[PDB]
Amino acid sequence: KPQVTILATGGTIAGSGESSVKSSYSAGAVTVDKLLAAVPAINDLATIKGEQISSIGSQEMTGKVWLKLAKRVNELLAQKETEAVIITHGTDTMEETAFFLNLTVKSQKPVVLVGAMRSGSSMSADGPMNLYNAVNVAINKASTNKGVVIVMNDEIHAAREATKLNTTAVNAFASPNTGKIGTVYYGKVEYFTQSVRPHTLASEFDISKIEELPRVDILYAHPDDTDVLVNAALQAGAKGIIHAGMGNGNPFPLTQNALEKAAKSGVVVARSSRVGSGSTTQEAEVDDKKLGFVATESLNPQKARVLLMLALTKTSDREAIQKIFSTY
Amino acid sequence: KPQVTILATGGTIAGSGESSVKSSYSAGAVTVDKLLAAVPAINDLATIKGEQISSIGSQEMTGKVWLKLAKRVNELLAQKETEAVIITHGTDTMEETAFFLNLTVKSQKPVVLVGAMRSGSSMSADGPMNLYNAVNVAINKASTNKGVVIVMNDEIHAAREATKLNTTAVNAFASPNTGKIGTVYYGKVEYFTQSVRPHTLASEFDISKIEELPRVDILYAHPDDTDVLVNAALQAGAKGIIHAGMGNGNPFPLTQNALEKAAKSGVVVARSSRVGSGSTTQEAEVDDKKLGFVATESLNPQKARVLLMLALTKTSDREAIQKIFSTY
Amino acid sequence: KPQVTILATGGTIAGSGESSVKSSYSAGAVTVDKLLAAVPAINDLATIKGEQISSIGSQEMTGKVWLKLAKRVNELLAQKETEAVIITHGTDTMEETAFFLNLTVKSQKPVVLVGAMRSGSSMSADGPMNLYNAVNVAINKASTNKGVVIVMNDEIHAAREATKLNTTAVNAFASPNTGKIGTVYYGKVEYFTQSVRPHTLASEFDISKIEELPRVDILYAHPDDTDVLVNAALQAGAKGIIHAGMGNGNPFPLTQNALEKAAKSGVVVARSSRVGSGSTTQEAEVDDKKLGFVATESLNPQKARVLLMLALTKTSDREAIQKIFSTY
Amino acid sequence: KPQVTILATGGTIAGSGESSVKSSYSAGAVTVDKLLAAVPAINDLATIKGEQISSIGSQEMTGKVWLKLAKRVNELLAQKETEAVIITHGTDTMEETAFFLNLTVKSQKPVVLVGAMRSGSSMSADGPMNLYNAVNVAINKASTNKGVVIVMNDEIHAAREATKLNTTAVNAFASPNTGKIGTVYYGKVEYFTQSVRPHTLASEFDISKIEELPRVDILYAHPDDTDVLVNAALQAGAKGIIHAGMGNGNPFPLTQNALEKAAKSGVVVARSSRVGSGSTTQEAEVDDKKLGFVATESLNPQKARVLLMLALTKTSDREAIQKIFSTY
Ligand SMILES: N[C@@H](CC(=O)O)C(=O)O
Ligand SMILES: N[C@@H](CC(=O)O)C(=O)O
Ligand SMILES: N[C@@H](CC(=O)O)C(=O)O
Ligand SMILES: N[C@@H](CC(=O)O)C(=O)O
C-alpha cells in the first residue's frame, strides 16, 4: 500500500464524538485517528500517518502557519517512503493555502487539500465522502505533476483556479475561469485537463529561509469611495495593496489618487476586481504604466494577494511583478 | 406610441462618431439624439425624450448623482404622459444604481437600466441590441410592477438579484441566487418569474428630502487581517461598515475585535461575504446578537452597502436593521 | 402540528437496513415508517401519514402511475386536515412527474417532490437532509400557491423550470432558464421569486376522468439524420412527436419532410431543442405555420412531451396547442 | 506574416450585402473575400487564402462533408507554407464537426472552428469579433498541439469538451464538464489549461480511405418509452445506437429489452444521457457486461455518436469500444 501523510490544520472534517473503542494503531495525531475511525475504508487504500500542524478555523489562518505548513510538506515529500500529502482544512481560506502551496512546494508528488461544508455531526455530512475521494486522488498515478489540487464534491480543482464561490452549498467550490481538471466519483479518479501555468517544481519562489511574509492589504472598491483606507494601509507598513476594483479593475478617482501616491512611495499596487471572474486586463481603461500599477489578470483578489506576497520576498519592481502575474 | 424618457448618465452606449445629418427632432439631450441615430428602429416603438443627468463613467458614481437620478425618475413617472424610464449607465456600478432605484422609486411604471460591455465603436458592439431590447421591455404591459430591472444580453434581471460577475464578457450580468426573471430576444419580451421581495411602491424608504446619504465603508477579509482599516473608517465618520467576510461571513479575530468596538460606538456592522453567491446567514459561526452585528443574508457587499445606507436614513438600531435585511 | 402525507413511489431515500426497534406508530406505509426512523427530527415538525403509490425506479415510470398519483394528491389536498403532500421519487424522471402534477393538481396547498442522488446506505447520503428540508418547505406558510416544487440540495425549484442537469452530482438539479425560486438551509425556508406562468388551480387541464394518456414520442436530432424513426412513431400510433432539434429547434432536411407528412396526417409535431436551455422560438429558421408545427418555446423535450400529452386530451389543433405552449 | 487558410462551409458569418468595391486580391473563394472586406484587420495578421468546402446550414451536415473536410484539412496542414486552418461553420452542429476533426486531423498545427449566433446583418452581430479572435488564436505559438478548438464569445474551447448549450444566446457555447481552456480578448490569446485526452496526431483513427461512415442512430429516453424506434434503427441498418438515457444513462424496461436484442445482433449499443453534463458511468444501475452495452462516460449523445462512428470503422467489439470511450 502507498504511504500518505494527512496533515490536520484544525478539527475533524468527518465523524462526530468519541471512538467506540481505543484504536491499537496510532497514525501520529488524534485528529487523524478520528478520521480513520469515521472513514475506515481509507485504511484499505493507503498506510496513513498523521500530524497536527495547527488547530484553528481557516478564518484564523496566518502567514506563519502557511510557512510552517509549506516547509513541512516539502520535508515530507523529500522522503522516499512518502507518496503524497493530504491536508484537511477549513473551507473559508482553503483556496489561499492551496495557491500558496502551489507556488512553494518543490515536488511533483500529489498534494491534496480537502474540507467539508457541513459539520461532521450533521445529517448528510459531506466530509466522509470528500476525504475518501481525496485519498483516492492522492494515490492515483495521474495525479503526479498536476500541482496542488482541491478535492470537493466529487471534483478535482487546480489550486491556481479554485475558489469558494457560495457561502453554504456543498458544491461551493468552483474554478470560474477554467473548470475542474478532473473528477472523483466513489474513488474513481479521472483527469480531463491540466494547468499550463507553471507550478510547484517549476516555480521560482523558495520560502525555506523565510520567517515572515510581506504585508499585503486588500481594498474593496465602490461608488463614493475613499482615500483613507489606502492611507491606513500605508501607515501600517503595507508593502503591497490589492485593489478589488469595479468592473475590469477600475478605481474611484479619489482612491486612484491615493494609490498613485502609494505606488510612488514604493508600495506595489496590484489591480484585481470585485466581480468574481475574468481577467483584470492590461491596456483597458487604467494606464498602469503611467500610474505605476500591476494588472493581476486572471486571478481574484485573495489569490493575487498571495502571489504579490511571494513576489515581494524577491522584488518591488513594477515590471518584474507584472511579469510574475502574467506567468503564474 | 407610448412616451418614454431616456436618461443618460454618461456617453453613448451605441454608435460612434458624428451623425451623417443634423436631426430635425431634438429629443432633449445630444447623447440621446446620438442613440436614436445609431438605433433608428427605436423611434417606431415609442416617442422618445432625452435628458442628461450626469456625464461620467460608472466607476465615478456618487450618492449625490443617485439622489438626483431617483428624484428625477420619481418626477417623470408621476406624469400621466410618461409610461416608463430607461437609464443608460456604465456597467461597473449599474447594479448599485438599479438596487438604489428599486428601493426609492415610488411607482409601478417600468424603470430599465441598460449598458454595453463593449465600446460603441468596437467590432460586434453590444449596445445597439441592448438598447433596442431595453425599449421593448420598457413598453411591455407585463413589465409593470416588476420593480427596477437591468436588461443586458437578451436577459431581464431583477435589480435586487443582478450583479456584474465577469470583468469583460458581454454576458457578464447574472442573478447568481435566483436567475433572470425574463427574456428579450429581438424585442420579444417574456417574463417567467417575478421577485417576491418588496420593492418600489412597497418600499419604506423615501429620499425626497435627503441631500446626502450616510457614509458606509466596505472591508475585504482575508487571512492575517488587520484592525487598521476598521479604525480608519471609524475615524472618517462611517455610520456603517459592510464586512465582506471569509466563507459564510467570517472575520479574522483581530478584525472581529475592532468591528465589535465599532458596533458598540453606534456604527452599524453588517456581515456579507467575499465569495460571490449565497446567504450570509444568521446563527452560523458568528454570534451576531452578542457582538452587535447584522447578517446581510442573500445580497453581496456592494448591494448590502446600498441597503444599509438607506436603512441609516431612518435608524441605527441593530434589530430594526436586521429586519430590513430580512425583508428587502 | 400540521398534518402532511408522504407518498412513496419507490424505496426509501434515507437510511439503510432494518429499524433498531419496531415502531409503535404506523404512518400507513412501511417505506414511510423507515423514513421516520432514519430522519426522526421530521416527527417534531408535522404529523406524518404515509402511502405507497408505486414501487419502482423512476426510469420505469408510466402515464398510468402519473394518473394514479395526480388523482390521489387531488383527493388528499381536498381534505381539510391535510396541509401538504410530499412525494419521494427517483431523480431520473422527477422533473416529468413534477411538471405533470403542476398542471393537474387543483389546489394551492404545497406539493413537494424530493429524492436523493446517493443511496441511503452511502457515505455522505443526501436523502436525510433533502427530506428534512422538504418537510420544512411543505409546512411553510409562504409555500402556498407556489405550484409544485422540487426540493434538492438546499434549493427550491419551480416544477415548470426544474431539470436534472448532471448524471451524478448531488447538485444535479437546476432551473437553467430562471434559477431556483427559494432556499432551504437546515430547515430555514426563504422564497425570492415565484413563477408568473399559470399552474395548479389556474390550469385548464383536468385528468379526473382520464384512464390513459395520449402517446407522444421524442426524437433526437443530428447531422445525417433519418426519416425512419418519425415513420415508426406514426406506425405505432403516436398522437404527438417532440423533435429535439439542433440549435434553435432545427431539423435535418429528410427528417423535416417526414415531420411535415406526420403533421398533415394529424399527428401534432412540436419543436424543442437538444441543447439544454433557452427557448425554441417562433419565427426563426423554421416556418412553423407553413409546415404545420408548434414551437415549444422555453421548455425542454421531456417537459414539452408532458404538456403535449395533456393538450392532446383536449385538441390536436396547431394554433390552440401553440397557445398552450405560449401560456404554461 | 503567417499563411492561413479559411475554409467556409456555408455563407458569411460577418458582414452583409455587396462589397463597396471589387477587391483586387482574390483569396480563392467569394465567401472569404466577403469576410476580408467585413473584417479588414485580419489582413494585417496573416496572409489569408480561402476555399469553399460546402455551402450549407450546419443542420444539413452529413458524413460525406465531414470526410471531405477532414481530408482537405490534412492536405493543407501537410504543406510547409500553411501554418493553420480556420473553418467557418454554423453553430448548430459545430461541436460534432470539431470533435470529428479532433480525432482525424494528423497534425499539431492549429485548427480553429468559428461561427456566429446572430446574423451578420443583425444589430450587434457577433461574427466579426469571433472571426478576428479566431485568426489570432490560429496564429498564436501556444495554440500548437492544443487539438482542434472552437473560438466563440472571447473563449477557446477544446473540441472534446465543447457543446452548444443554449438555443439563442451569443454565449451559447460552453464546456460543461471542464470549462474553457483559454481566452481571446480583442485578439490577446492566453491559455490556462490543455486537454490530457489524446487527440489529433495521437489518435488511432485514419479516414484517408473512408468514403462513407457507419450509420449510428440516437434515441431519446423517457417514461413510458418504446421498442419501436430501436427496431426501426436496426431495420434501417444501424451499426451503432447511442441511447440518451434518463439520469445516469438509464433505459426504460421495454427499451432495454430491445437494445439487448440489438447488441446481440452485433449492433453496438452505447449508453449516454439526456441530462446535459456528467459521466454516464460504468458499474452504476445498468449491468453493461451482462447486457452487452458500452458506457460513453464523459461525453454527450451527439459527440458519443461521432466517436462510435469512428470506432466502427475499426471494430464492433464491446470491450475494444469501451476502451475507446475510456481513452478519448
Ligand atoms: N469556517 C469554517 C468553514 C468550513 O470549514 O466549512 C472554516 O473555514 O474553518
Ligand atoms: N468602466 C465602464 C464600463 C462599461 O460601461 O462597460 C463604466 O462602468 O462606465
Ligand atoms: N435511477 C434512480 C436515480 C435516483 O433516484 O437518484 C431513479 O431515478 O429512481
Ligand atoms: N442554423 C444555423 C445557426 C447558426 O449558425 O447560428 C446553422 O447552424 O448553420
Per residue, the 3-state secondary structure of chain A, as one string, reads CCEEEEEECCCCCCCCCCCCCCCCCCCCCHHHHHHHHHCCCHHHHCEEEEEECCCCCHHHCCHHHHHHHHHHHHHHHCCCCEEEEEEECCCCCHHHHHHHHHHHCCCCCCEEEECCCCCCCCCCCCHHHHHHHHHHHHCCHHHCCCCCEEEECCEEEECCCCEECCCCCCCCEECCCCCCCEEEECCEEEECEEECCCCHHHCCCCCCCCCCCCCEEEEECCCCCCCHHHHHHHHCCCCEEEEEEECCCECCHHHHHHHHHHHHCCCEEEEEECCCCCCECCCCCCCHHHHCEEECECCCHHHHHHHHHHHCCCCCCHHHHHHHHCCC
> Which one-letter amino acid corresponds to residue D240?
G
Closest residue of B to A222, CA-based? B302
| H/E element, D3 | strand D3-8
d(CA D256, CA B239): 67
**What residues have CB less than 8 Å from C140, skipping those under 6 apart?**
C110, C189
Kindly give the number of the ligand 4 atom that is closest to the alpha carbon of D92.
8
Q: Do residues C244 and C269 touch, judged by C-beta distance below 8 A? A: no
User: Would you mind telling me the total number of residues written for chain C in this entry?
Assistant: 328
Closest CA to D248 of D219, D271, D230, D269: D271
Which residue is closest to B184 within chain C, CA to CA? C279
Active-site residue, B82 included: no
Sign of CA dihedral B55, B56, B60, B63: positive
Residues in chain A: 328
Q: Which chains touch A (3 or more CB pairs under 8 A)?
A: B, C, D
Query: C130: CA distance to ligand 3 center in Å?
Result: 14
D168 lines ligand 4 (CB under 6 A): no
How close, in Å, is residue D105 to chain C by CA atoms? 20
Q: How far is the CA of C200 from the centre of ligand 3 (A)?
A: 26
Q: Which residues of C touch D275 (CB under 8 A)?
A: 163-167, 172
Q: Which amino acid is at D218?
A: I
Q: What pairing do the DSSP bridges indicate for beta strands B155-158 and B182-185?
A: antiparallel
CA angle at residue A39 from A37 to A40, to 5 degrees? 65
Among all bound ligands, the one having the nearest atom to the CA of B152 is 2
Residue among D5, D9, D12, D200 flagged as catalytic: D12
* Cα gap D181→D155, rounded to integer Å: 8
Could you say which DSSP state residue B81 is in?
A: T
Residues paired with D7 in a beta bridge: D51, D87
- Residue D90 and residue D58 in contact, taking contact as beta carbons nearer than 8 Å: yes
C-alpha D63/C-alpha D58 separation (Å) is 12
| Contacting residues for A21 by C-beta, under 8 A, at least 6 apart | none
**What distance, in Å, lies between the first and last C-alpha atoms of chain B?**
35
C-alpha cell belonging to residue A56: 484553528
| Residues A53, A43: Cα–Cα separation, whole Å | 21
| Backbone conformation region of residue B236, classed left if phi is above 0, alpha if psi is from -120 to 50, else beta | alpha
Q: Taking Cα atoms as reference points, which of B259, B188, B260 lies closest to residue B230?
A: B259
Cell numbers for B142, please give them: 407585463
- Residue among C221, C235, C228, C244 at smallest CA distance from C308: C244
Q: Which among D178, D183, D281 has CB closest to A192?
A: D178
Would you say D122 and D170 are in contact if contact means Cβ atoms under 8 Å apart?
A: no
Classify B169 in phi/psi space as left (phi over 0), alpha (psi -120 to 50) or beta.
beta
CB-CB under 8 Å, A128 with C123? yes
How far apart (Å, rounded) are the C-alpha atoms in residues B141 and C186? Answer: 39
Instruction: Check if the beta carbon of residue C112 is closer than 8 Å to that of residue C149.
Output: yes
Partners of A170 on chain C (C-beta within 8 Å) are: 153, 170-171
Torsion angle in degrees (nearest 10) through CA of D153, D159, D164, D169: 0
For ligand 1, say whether the CB of A127 is within 6 Å of any of its atoms. Answer: no
- Residue A260 Cα distances to A175, A287, A326, angstroms: 32, 11, 21
Q: How far is residue B256's CA from residue A140's CA, in Å, rounded to a whole number?
A: 41
Q: Which of C12, C104, C163, C200 is catalytic?
A: C12
Binding-site residues of C: 91-92
Contact D159, D101 (CB under 8 A): yes
Whole-number Å distance between alpha carbons of B298 and B279 = 4
- Distance separating alpha carbons of residues A88 and A52, to the nearest angstrom: 10
- Report CA(C85)–ligand 3 centroid distance (Å): 20
Q: B120 in helix, strand or coil?
A: coil
Cβ neighbors of D7 (< 8 A, separation 6 or more) are: D50, D51, D52, D53, D69, D72, D73, D85, D86, D87, D88
Pocket of ligand 4 contains residue D117 by CB under 6 Å: yes
Query: What contacts A235, CB < 8 A, 6 or more positions away?
Result: B228
Q: Would the CB atoms of D277 and C167 count as touching at under 8 Å?
A: yes
**B316-322 contacts: CB < 8 A, separation 24 or more?**
B316/B239, B316/B266, B316/B268, B318/B263, B318/B268, B318/B292, B318/B293, B318/B294, B321/B268, B321/B270, B321/B294, B322/B282, B322/B288, B322/B294, B322/B295
Q: Which of D92, D114, D131, D170 to mutate to test the pocket of ligand 4 (most atoms within 8 A of CB)?
A: D92
Min Cα separation A125/chain C (Å): 5
Q: In what order do the strands lie in the sheet with D240-245?
A: C293-295, C268-273, C240-245, C216-220, D216-220, D240-245, D268-273, D293-295
Strand D268-273 with B193-195, pairing: unpaired
Give the C-alpha separation, D47 to D3, whole Å: 5
Grid cell 458598540 is found at: B264
Nearest to D174 by CA among D199, D192, D156: D156
Q: Is B287 annotated as a binding residue?
A: no
Task: Report whether B91 belongs to an annotated binding site.
Answer: yes
Contact B278, C185 (CB under 8 A): no
DSSP 8-state symbol, C316: -
Q: Which amino acid is at A255?
A: T
Residue D242 Cα to ligand 4 middle (Å): 24
Which residues lie with the beta carbon below 6 Å from any ligand 3 atom? C 10, 57-59, 90-92, 115-117; D 247, 250, 285
Give CA–CA dist D162/D101, Å, rounded: 13
CA distance B115 to B110: 17
- Specify the resolution in Å: 1.6
Rounded Cα–Cα distance for residues A58 and D222 (Å): 46
A127, B103, B179, B194, B222 from B176: Cα distances, Å: 26, 20, 6, 15, 23
* Rounded Cα–Cα distance for residues A97 and A303 (Å): 9
What the block records as the C-alpha cell of D90 is 454554423
CA of A93 to the centre of ligand 1 (A): 8
Contact call for C171 and A153, based on CB within 8 A: yes
Q: Which residues of chain C neighbour B295 with C-beta distances below 8 Å?
A: none
| Smallest Cα distance from D11 to chain B, Å | 18
Instruction: Give the number of other CB atoms < 10 A from CB of residue C65.
Output: 18
D231, D217 in Cβ contact below 8 A?
A: no
CB atoms within 10 A of CB A205: 18
Note the Cα D280 to chain centre separation in Å.
Answer: 20
Q: What sign does the dihedral D12-D16-D18-D19 (CA atoms) show?
A: negative
Going from the N-terminus, what domains does chain A have, and what CATH number goes with each? 1-214 (3.40.50.1170), 215-327 (3.40.50.40)
CB A12 within 8 A of CB A120: yes
Taking CB atoms and an 8 Å cutoff, what residues of chain A touch C185?
168
Distance CA D243, CA D262 (A): 12
Are the beta carbons of D123 and B122 separated by less than 8 Å?
A: no
Structural biology method used: X-ray
Are B50 and B88 spatial neighbours (Cβ–Cβ below 8 Å)? no
